[PDB]
């Protein structure tokens, strides 16, 4: 049977989120990126809502809650994109939303094919490892908790306890299918290594983001309110490496 914290995590997952994209018109770089940013804003709002229901999170200092959301949003978005692509189209298209799906041809015709290929890595990796929903749910929490300030958090003690709790929960999730101690220990390494490796992929997305934000008027790319807020709040600092990424391994 499923451990209760994992069942809770499944129950607080966001519903389907639409981009609001107009698919009756041919793609342009402006229109596609603008629609992705509108989808982004909606997903960001859902992350905030989810975080209010996430066990432990509300008990961190409010300033730590804001910081963790501001540090982790890109990671959470691309991880979710990977999962949706894996679950709905067998990993073979980028499933941003039910109304915004990029097959490879649409990726190629875009102005950001290379970015698409970088993002397309994650679902191909989920296909490879056959990530379970229970593993995904725990891993996604750990991504929320995977970078802290250089000076640490105000609620550092509670944060450490929360993070450790979800790491123990991931171990329980692995235990649902992987019977055997050797396989289970190796799977822990693999999933946590995948999380370590996401830091590098996300850095590429962060650089793209900040360049796009700076150039948004010239590119005719709209950045909505909360997205602009989180970018302005922390993105240069994150890109500069003036934060502490938490690594599971060397
Ligand atoms: C939404 C969504 N789903 O997966 C990913 C990745 C996103 C996402 C993540 C970040 C942003 C912020 N803007 S951006 O960095 O210029 C950008 C745009 C526009 N599209 N993408 C994929 C990025 Cl990154 C917009 C969309």
Give kind and range of the element (H or E) at residue 245.
strand 244-245
Q: What is the residue with the minimal CA distance to atom 24 of ligand 1?
A: 205
Query: How many Å apart are CA 2 and CA 132, to the nearest integer?
Result: 12
Residue keyed to tokens 């997903």:
43
Collapsing DSSP states into helix, strand and coil, what is residue 94?
strand
Asked if 81 and 122 touch (Cβ cutoff 8 Å), the reply is yes
Ligand 1 geometric centre to CA of 35 (Å): 9
In the PDB record, what is the listed experimental method? Answer: X-ray
Strands 244-245 and 100-102, bridge-based pairing = unpaired
Asked if 162 and 58 touch (Cβ cutoff 8 Å), the reply is no
Question: Which token pair is 91?
Answer: 């990993």
Residue 77 CB-half CA count within 13 A: 27
Q: What is the residue with the minimal CA distance to atom 6 of ligand 1?
A: 78
What totals of helices (H) and strands (E) does the chain contain, helices first?
10, 4
Ligand 1 geometric centre to CA of 186 (Å): 32
Angle between helices 62-89 and 133-144 (to 10 degrees): 150
Asked if 89 and 76 touch (Cβ cutoff 8 Å), the reply is no
Instruction: Look up the CATH number of the domain holding residue 112.
Output: 1.10.565.10
Collapsing DSSP states into helix, strand and coil, what is residue 241?
coil
Query: How many Å apart are CA 52 and CA 119, to the nearest integer?
Result: 28
Ligand 1 geometric centre to CA of 97 (Å): 12
**Other CB atoms within 10 A of residue 20 CB:** 12
Contacts of 129 (CB under 8 A, 6+ apart): 190, 191, 194
Query: How many Å apart are CA 54 and CA 123, to the nearest integer?
Result: 24
Q: What is the DSSP letter of 152?
A: -
Residue keyed to tokens 């049977």:
1
Query: How many Å apart are CA 136 and CA 145, to the nearest integer?
Result: 14
**Residue 202 CB–ligand 1 contact under 6 Å:** no
**Residue 78 CB–ligand 1 contact under 6 Å:** yes
Strands 147-148 and 244-245, bridge-based pairing = antiparallel
Ligand 1 geometric centre to CA of 5 (Å): 30
**Residue 32 CB–ligand 1 contact under 6 Å:** no
The count of domains in the chain is: 1
Query: How many Å apart are CA 151 and CA 159, to the nearest integer?
Result: 14
Ligand 1 geometric centre to CA of 173 (Å): 29
Query: How many Å apart are CA 85 and CA 55, to the nearest integer?
Result: 27
**Other CB atoms within 10 A of residue 12 CB:** 14
Angle between helices 156-175 and 181-214 (to 10 degrees): 130
**Residue 37 CB–ligand 1 contact under 6 Å:** yes
Please name every residue paired with 102 in a beta bridge, in sequence order, or none if there are none. Answer: 94
Q: Which residues make up each annotated binding site? A: 84
Name the phi and psi angles at 9, rounded to 5: -55, -45
Closest residue by Cα to residue 55 from 166, 146, 211, 182: 166
Ligand 1 geometric centre to CA of 235 (Å): 14
Question: Which token pair is 39?
Answer: 């989808």
**Residue 81 CB–ligand 1 contact under 6 Å:** yes
Torsion of Cα atoms, 209 then 96 then 92 then 25, to 10°: -100
**Other CB atoms within 10 A of residue 190 CB:** 15
Question: Which token pair is 143?
Answer: 């991504």
Domain that holds residue 143: 1-250
Ligand 1 pocket check: which of 77, 102, 221 to mutate, most ligand atoms within 8 Å of Cβ?
77
Strands 94-97 and 244-245, bridge-based pairing = unpaired
Angle between helices 225-239 and 62-89 (to 10 degrees): 100
Query: How many Å apart are CA 104 and CA 101, to the nearest integer?
Result: 10
Question: Which token pair is 127?
Answer: 């296909």
Query: How many Å apart are CA 204 and CA 131, to the nearest integer?
Result: 24
């Amino acid at each position: 049977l499923i451990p209760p914290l994992i069942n809770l995590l499944m129950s607080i997952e966001p519903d389907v989120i639409y981009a609001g994209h107009d698919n009756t018109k041919p793609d342009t770089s402006s229109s596609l990126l603008t629609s992705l940013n509108q989808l982004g804003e909606r997903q960001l709002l859902s992350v905030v809502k989810w975080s209010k229901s996430l066990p432990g999170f509300r008990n961190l200092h409010i300033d730590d809650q804001i910081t963790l959301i501001q540090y982790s949003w890109m990671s959470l978005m691309v991880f979710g994109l990977g999962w949706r692509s894996y679950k709905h189209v067998s990993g073979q298209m980028l499933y941003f939303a039910p109304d915004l799906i990029l097959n490879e041809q649409r990726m190629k015709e875009s102005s950001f094919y290379s970015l698409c290929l970088t993002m397309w890595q994650i679902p191909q990796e989920f296909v490879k490892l056959q990530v379970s929903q229970e593993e995904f749910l725990c891993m996604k929490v750990l991504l929320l908790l995977n970078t802290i300030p250089l000076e640490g958090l105000r609620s550092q003690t509670q944060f450490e306890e929360m993070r450790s709790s979800y790491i123990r929960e991931l171990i329980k999730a692995i235990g649902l299918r992987q019977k055997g101690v050797v396989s289970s220990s190796q799977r822990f390494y693999q999933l946590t290594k995948l999380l370590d490796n996401l830091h590098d992929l996300v850095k590429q997305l962060h650089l793209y983001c900040l360049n796009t934000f700076i150039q948004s008027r010239a590119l005719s790319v709209e950045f909505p309110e909360m997205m602009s807020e989180v970018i302005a709040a922390q993105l240069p600092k994150i890109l500069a490496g003036m934060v502490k990424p938490l690594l599971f391994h060397k």
